[PDB]
A paper describes a structure:
Complex I couples the transfer of two electrons from NADH to ubiquinone (Q) with the translocation of four protons across the membrane. The L-shaped complex is structured into a peripheral arm that protrudes into the aqueous milieu and catalyzes electron transfer with one FMN and 8–10 iron–sulfur ([Fe–S]) clusters, and a membrane arm embedded in the lipid bilayer that mediates proton translocation. We have determined structures of the electron-input module of complex I from the hyperthermophilic bacterium Aquifex aeolicus, encompassing subunits NuoE and NuoF that contain the FMN cofactor, the [4Fe–4S] cluster N3, and the [2Fe–2S] cluster N1a, respectively, both in the air-oxidized and dithionite-reduced states at resolutions up to 1.8 Å. Here, we show that the redox state of N1a regulates NADH oxidation in complex I by inducing a conformational change close to the NADH-binding site.
Numbering used by the authors:
A (entry chain B): 3 to 418
B (entry chain A): 5 to 160
The structure:
């Protein structure tokens, strides 16, 4: 018996990552095996680690955690360095509007586990971790139980299926910090320290956990690995547009009729995600803005863009938060500012002070208590969070808010 | 002087033996301590540091950093209320108003019996089911005051 989880709606046009996770319940090892589960692992163990890296590279799979680095290439960089190597599954999630990873974890954990085993074998890692945010306790208990099921079926431990390949998967829990999703801060947390990002280079693939070559991959990226092995890289590449191939999970929330996770190809447009798949807007009201998590803001004039990694594409992690005509953009911007204020680790001065000031001044603007100096200060701080920043948070803390100032000036003007 | 009860000490040793290095168990241990006491007792930090083979200042810094840990208020049930963008858009204020009507407390406050504490939190990752709240490990979509009242009556 696991803790209560809300029943997030899930729908797929590809029947891949959501083949089982489209149903709101835990699918245990017997049900996973009945669908042909762990047969991709068996096929992978008859291949050389180098051939698996080649297949994952040729599939064109790119990281699903936000930076979109080619997966096969990341693995190639890691194995160019001597062992021991470590494999890490990043299940920290935590970005506003993003809930795609938890549905794989909580409903189809063996899909993730199988992908972790194949990936660890590919990079020569005998020790793997899942770092799951502390606010996903059910996901944690589900993963611990699924790992035990995999051990008893001989898919983990020493000499897996007589291959001579050894692997243990440890499940670590976060304890409240969004910054622990940043790959270097995640590694610090796994070492039992504060989640403070480290300056890069060195990159984790060279010096990560205990200063050893470490591959960190997002849950969704890993969940694709059993499909590339099972189908072959060529058949996997046939899914969706050839330049951004494979299934993609789209967490859709806000002012839509059917909020939830959608498994779709990346040539789907933002307009199709909202109107064709998520059932349109609540009360058929006009779309005002789409927040790409806490990263970007798209206006109603930008809905015909593809949901891919292209420069003119949606980008990010495919997180779709819909705001309609009556939603106040300044109030919405305040919530984004409050997120960054709460999550800066404070190591870098412009990030520390800038995230704090951006939220504090925006609150004064929102409440009608801002002086002319507060308005000018807010504009200045929003443009100055990034200088000297060690990690991505400082670089993006002002990004969405700046786009709302550029795309909705009339609304901002009524606060002046 | 402060000593962990054997039932908790056994659970802490199990986490310490789980990872390849003792110090990697720090967060699992602190989750265990909070689940047992309903907070992190300041006095628990020194014997925990000794078990992890870490300096006390290290452990103190870790507890201060990870904001799921509470060193100030003892509470049987932590009502974590999402105050982020989607939940704000969909009704965080209606949920907070319903919580105040039922429990008589506001965010950051603990009921007189020490039973419930409202904890405002960032995005809980269940945005499609906004406004979201947790009661310790259980997570729910808030529908209305009558629905919330029935949920909370299950925590005794
Ligand atoms: C502030 C910050 C938070 C991040 N949070 C996450 C997260 O929760 N999950 C994730 O997989 N990647 C996250 N990332 C990106 C990771 O650092 C890293 O790029 C990723 O885990 C690598 O996996 P991928 O190549 O499969 O995408 C975050 C990055 C930054 C700058
Ligand atoms: S940029 Fe911000 S979040 Fe990143 S290391 Fe610096 S202070 Fe911490
Ligand atoms: S914004 Fe509340 S759960 Fe995501
Ligand atoms: Cl084979
Ligand atoms: Cl990054
Ligand atoms: Cl200037
Ligand atoms: Cl000491
Ligand atoms: Na975390």
């Amino acid at each position: 018996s696991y803790p209560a989880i809300p029943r997030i709606y899930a729908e797929t046009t590809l029947n891949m990552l959501l083949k089982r996770a489209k149903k709101p319940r835990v699918h245990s090892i017997d049900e996973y095996l009945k669908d042909g589960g762990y047969q991709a692992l068996e096929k992978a163990l008859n291949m050389s680690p180098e051939e698996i890296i080649d297949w994952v590279d040729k599939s064109t799979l790119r990281g699903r955690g936000g930076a979109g680095f080619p997966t096969g290439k990341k693995w190639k960089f890691a194995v160019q360095n001597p062992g021991p190597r470590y494999f890490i599954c990043n299940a920290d999630e935590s970005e506003p509007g993003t809930f795609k990873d938890r549905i794989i974890i909580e409903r189809d954990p063996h899909l993730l586990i199988e992908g972790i085993i194949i990936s660890s074998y590919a990079i020569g890692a005998n020790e793997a971790y899942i770092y799951i945010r502390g606010e996903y306790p059910a996901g944690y208990y589900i993963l611990r139980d699924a790992i035990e099921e995999a051990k008893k079926k001989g898919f983990l431990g020493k000499n897996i299926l007589g291959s001579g390949f050894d692997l243990e998967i440890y499940v670590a829990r976060g304890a409240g910090a969004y910054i622990c999703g940043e790959e270097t801060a995640l590694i610090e947390s796994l070492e039992g320290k504060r989640g403070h990002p480290r300056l890069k280079p060195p990159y984790p693939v060279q010096k990560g956990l205990w200063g050893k070559p470490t591959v960190v991959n997002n849950v969704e990226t890993i969940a694709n690995v059993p499909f590339i092995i099972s189908m072959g890289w060529e058949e996997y590449r046939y899914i969706g547009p050839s330049d951004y191939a494979g299934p993609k999970l789209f967490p859709v929330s806000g002012k839509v009729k059917k909020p939830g996770v959608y498994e779709l190809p990346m040539n789907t447009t933002l307009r199709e995600v909202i109107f064709k798949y998520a059932g349109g807007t609540l009360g058929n009201k006009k779309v005002k803005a789409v927040f790409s998590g806490a990263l970007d803001c798209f206006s109603s004039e930008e809905l015909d863009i593809p949901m891919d990694y292209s420069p003119l594409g949606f980008g990010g992690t495919g997180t779709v938060i819909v705001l309609t005509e009556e939603d106040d953009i300044v109030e919405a911007a305040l919530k984004i500012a409050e997120f960054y204020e709460h999550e800066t680790c404070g190591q870098c001065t412009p990030c520390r002070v800038g995230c704090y000031e951006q939220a504090n001044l925006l609150e004064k603007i929102y409440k009608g208590e801002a002086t002319e100096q507060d308005w000018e200060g807010f504009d200045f701080v929003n443009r100055n969070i990034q200088p000297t920043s060690i990690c991505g948070l400082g670089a993006v803390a002002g990004r969405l808010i700046r786009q709302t100032l550029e795309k909705f000036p009339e609304e901002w003007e009524k606060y002046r | 002087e402060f000593e962990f009860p054997e039932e908790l000490k056994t659970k802490l040793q199990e986490h310490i033996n789980y990872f390849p290095k003792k110090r990697q168990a720090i967060l699992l241990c602190l989750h265990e301590i909070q689940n047992y006491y309903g907070y992190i007792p300041p006095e628990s930090l020194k014997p925990l540091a000794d078990m992890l083979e870490l300096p006390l200042n290290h452990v103190e810094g870790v507890v201060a950093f990870y904001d799921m840990f509470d060193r100030e208020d003892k509470a049987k049930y932590r009502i974590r209320v999402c105050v982020s963008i989607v939940c704000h858009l969909m009704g965080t204020n209606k949920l907070l108003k319903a919580l105040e009507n039922i429990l008589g407390i506001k965010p950051g406050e603990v009921t007189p019996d020490g039973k419930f504490k409202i904890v405002p939190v960032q995005c809980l990752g269940a945005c499609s089911e906004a406004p979201v709240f947790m009661v310790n490990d259980d997570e729910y979509k808030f529908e209305s005051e009558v629905q919330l009242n029935e949920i909370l009556s299950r925590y005794t």
